[PDB]
Amino acid sequence: SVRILTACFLSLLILSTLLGNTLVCAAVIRFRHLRSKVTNFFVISLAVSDLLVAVLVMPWKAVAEIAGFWPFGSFCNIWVAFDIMCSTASILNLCVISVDRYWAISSPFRYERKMTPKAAFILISVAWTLSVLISFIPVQLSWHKAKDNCDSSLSRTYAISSSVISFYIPVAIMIVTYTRIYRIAQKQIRRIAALERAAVHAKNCFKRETKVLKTLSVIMGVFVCCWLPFFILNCILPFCGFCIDSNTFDVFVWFGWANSSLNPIIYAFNADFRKAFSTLLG
Amino acid sequence: QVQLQESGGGLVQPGGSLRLSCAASGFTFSNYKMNWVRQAPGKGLEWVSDISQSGASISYTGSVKGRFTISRDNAKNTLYLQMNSLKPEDTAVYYCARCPAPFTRDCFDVTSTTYAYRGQGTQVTVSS
Amino acid sequence: SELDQLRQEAEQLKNQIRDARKACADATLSQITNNIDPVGRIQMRTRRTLRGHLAKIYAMHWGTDSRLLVSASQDGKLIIWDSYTTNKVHAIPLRSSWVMTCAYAPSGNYVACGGLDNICSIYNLKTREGNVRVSRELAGHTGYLSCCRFLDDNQIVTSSGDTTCALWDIETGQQTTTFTGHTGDVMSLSLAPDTRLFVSGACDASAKLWDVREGMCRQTFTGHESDINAICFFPNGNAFATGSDDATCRLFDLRADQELMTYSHDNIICGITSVSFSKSGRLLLAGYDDFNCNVWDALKADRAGVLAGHDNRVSCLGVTDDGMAVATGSWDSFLKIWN
Amino acid sequence: QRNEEKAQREANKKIEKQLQKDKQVYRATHRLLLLGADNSGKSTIVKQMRIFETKFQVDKVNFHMFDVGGQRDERRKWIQCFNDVTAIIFVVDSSDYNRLQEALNLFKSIWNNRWLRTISVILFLNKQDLLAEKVLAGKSKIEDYFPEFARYTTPEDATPEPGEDPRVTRAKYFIRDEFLRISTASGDGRHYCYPHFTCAVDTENARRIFNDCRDIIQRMHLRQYELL
Amino acid sequence: SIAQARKLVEQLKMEANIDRIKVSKAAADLMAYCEAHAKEDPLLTPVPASENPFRE
Ligand SMILES: NCCc1ccc(O)c(O)c1
């Protein structure tokens, strides 16, 4: 009973991730008016990172979770590497996208001049290359393991190091950026409210703030409430392995790829994205 | 052919009264916002009051606020500027202008010489 | 008062004209064409997409070879396209970026364009030093140039916002003939297939037929409730269609001197921007402002097909002289070929 | 015949790379349309900033602002040539108490235009010194033209200049709110109106257009990400 | 004005003495020109993709 439910939920999760991200990638490839901007470049990078997460990492872990034994053997070294790569091409990309938005709200003129598609490609390259490097290079050199079923318990130093990078640098950048964007939007809201209140006061003779709060809270809070627990353990578990069991660690692992599932609707529901999806699927 | 015929308006002593009837022929009356543009002798065109697509929202120049009213009747296809308490300075020709586009809220119809969708005028004179 | 006596004889003439118009209205086009079969659903698809413009495209004109075409965008550019291979043959920068019209001489030797600078600029494509540059520049209008079309390599007709149209001698740069009589801004003109006459649609909701060589307005047609934005000729030469801001298309005949048919639906409340017939005149394509292009059956008033795919108002269109394809320019900075 | 195809292909290459440099130039230029009545200060603003066109740079950001001069008065159609401009600079004479309704109606017709639905307007309430002259003289009073002014109260957010007579403050803030009452009546956040009190001798009227073009871009980027 | 009225009157007298034909005939002529060229109109009768310069 529990096993068939885990199977169905995992299959739904994989299918949802794959469907959402392939839908974003299709809406991009078909419509050139979506590929025109630069923020869309970064969103495409995110969608492709998540599609890789799905197709490479998820199904094998779901199979090992159902069957109970890892049936791939010599694959799984590669597999754990893939995981470390794809789940880092995701977080990194979020950070990048966040920084992107910041430049286009804290300095609109400088942004429209300097961020030319060459800089977009350089940023995407830095993200993906940091991912591939930090993942594969320590795996094939067998640094990730500390000094059937196949072990994936990252070595104590590699866990904390790649964790600090892959999460705590992007979450720091993202929180700083989004709190600055909030300060700016609050400033503009107060100003527009001043003018509109002047008008209506002539006429007689906080809601938009809630909207800002709602959307920023949704973005940053989904990211955090989906990834933070995994990363908090990756910190505590190999260091201490109070402690937890494989099942709890495994569900908290699954939360990360769950965020990789939700990323499309939270980063790709601009109106044009909505209409492209509507004309794609029907 | 759009053509607008105004009627009413004659010599009336200060504090008198009048009613200017603008009958429109050649289009769909309900879709167009209507205005009254009066021209006093020696000055450019001046805009008096406007009434929306259905008499929903009306608005007035300051000088005629609280004196004149503007009513639209789609049945008889016309609109009326009912003037009361006319002053010696309300003496002017009264073109009945139509905005140039249907189903919208903007118009640019006080133009210096030639706007094609306003009538000919009923000179309303007020003096003692 | 002789002004009031001229106003009365004016109205007397307007009623003699309305009577002479209802006298010949023995039937309607719909009763005549009720027994024909409908053209059926016409679904053309984008076969080419011509990209490059950095701003909204505002005018285009196919060439006579039905292969090249020129497009004018308000980024200050005038690009010539080889529509078969989507290659660009020339990219002419404009001294004023607010271009509103562009033409392609029937000999393919010259392009013209103009706009808010009140100037029609001619560029020689067959230049001898290498690159297309300015050759002539026609001045005289006190208003913005809305449309212009060559007759030959030395005669060009312009339409302007000073409520006048003009026939020019490109070499001397003199307005060899002036056409006045419109009350509002003339927005579009279309020369008949025999160059002999041409029509103009103005913002006074009227279209006028002009005799090119004599400079007189022969017939004035009315019926639209608002500004006429586009006009064409029927391929036969004795009829033309107009589209106006009142969200209606109307087909006028020259010899009957009145409107024959009105193309509308009560769900379209948007202003037609461009009109053009197919090679046989059976299909009338119109570019509404609501981002779509409707293909109407010019004989039955039925809406037959739509051309969706633009993200902003479709500003212009044009059918090739061989009838092989139609092009559409929009404010999304893209031209799309359909067939 | 394939050789002419390769020549066309390299002609297309030279074209696209010229168009790429042209794209970068067009992308970084902020077009500004100058509009407003005559007997106003538009031409004085252009003279002070230093034709149909004007080109000026603020903080390494170039602008090219144009006021159309040789047209008729029916601006209902060439106006659509400016649907993509960054901002419209509307200049008004606060000292012409009766042609002021013409300015209010023109601002209303511009603000509700279907094709300028997203164009934000920078409002210059020009000739404030003459307005103070007329208010202190007390010969032509605003109430005769705008009876609302009789019951109008100076806003509590008002920032009068040192020594300004409360009558002048009430007059210029009344004209200010007469235009803001139109701009806030139907702007669904796609665009805004930014009022400014100016006189003919003011020199910073370029830094103000810079500030407010920047604010317009900020708010476009906010409303794009659904924040604002 | 007096000049725009003299021009409107002379324009209407010129426009009044034109001879108009019946709408039945004007429409029959449009119908004849339409069906006389119907078989050579590619947007109405679709041309095979082999002879279409815009299809591959
Ligand atoms: N499921 C992702 C596992 C993972 C990915 C990246 C890391 O840096 C890490 O410590 C752990």
Side-chain angles (χ1 to χ4, degrees), chain A residues 83-84 87-88 154 158-159 162-163 166 227 230-231 234 253 257:
Chain A
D83 182 24
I84 298 176
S87 316
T88 297
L154 320 175
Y158 175 90
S162 71
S163 198
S166 199
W227 271 112
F230 175 19
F231 285 79
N234 250 189
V253 159
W257 310 327

Side-chain angles (χ1 to χ4, degrees), chain C residues 106-142:
Chain C
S107 68
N109 290 322
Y110 300 81
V111 64
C113 81
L116 285 163
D117 58 30
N118 311 339
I119 302 186
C120 181
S121 319
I122 316 292
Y123 302 85
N124 186 0
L125 306 185
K126 303 302 175 56
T127 184
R128 294 271 300 94
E129 176 269 358
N131 293 330
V132 308
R133 52 203 179 72
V134 192
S135 90
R136 206 68 51 190
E137 273 182 345
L138 305 163
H141 286 289
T142 63

Side-chain angles (χ1 to χ4, degrees), chain C residues 3 9 13-14 16-17 20 24 26-27 29 47-48 84 217-218 234-235 253 255 258 278-280 323 325 339, chain E residues 1-2 9 11-12 14 16 18 20-24 26-27 29-30 33 37 41-43 52-55:
Chain C
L3 284 296
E9 54 180 81
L13 288 166
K14 294 296 146 60
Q16 179 253 311
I17 294 298
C24 52
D26 57 350
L29 174 61
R47 310 285 180 180
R48 301 290 196 268
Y84 286 174
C217 174
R218 300 170 157 244
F234 195 83
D253 187 305
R255 303 175 299 173
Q258 49 183 325
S278 167
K279 187 176 183 58
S280 72
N339 174 21
Chain E
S1 158
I2 298 66
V9 301
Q11 179 61 31
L12 287 164
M14 180 214 188
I18 302 160
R20 307 165 184 83
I21 294 173
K22 291 73 71 193
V23 163
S24 285
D29 292 23
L30 294 178
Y33 178 85
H37 298 62
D41 191 319
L43 296 188
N52 193 294
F54 297 95
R55 295 187 209 179

Side-chain angles (χ1 to χ4, degrees), chain A residues 187-261:
Chain A
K187 190 178 312 174
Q188 306 274 325
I189 283 303
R190 293 207 192 104
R191 185 181 309 178
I192 304 165
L195 281 197
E196 213 163 79
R197 200 166 70 262
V200 76
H201 177 253
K203 172 132 73 184
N204 317 297
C205 273
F206 195 81
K207 187 259 172 184
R208 273 179 306 270
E209 175 93 36
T210 288
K211 182 174 181 41
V212 167
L213 200 55
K214 174 249 193 176
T215 306
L216 293 187
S217 178
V218 161
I219 287 166
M220 182 57 78
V222 157
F223 172 78
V224 170
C225 167
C226 286
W227 271 112
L228 174 80
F230 175 19
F231 285 79
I232 251 324
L233 317 165
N234 250 189
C235 166
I236 177 175
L237 178 146
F239 181 73
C240 167
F242 205 53
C243 185
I244 47 184
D245 188 278
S246 90
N247 302 66
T248 67
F249 187 54
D250 193 336
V251 71
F252 280 160
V253 159
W254 270 113
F255 272 173
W257 310 327
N259 161 83
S260 280
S261 202

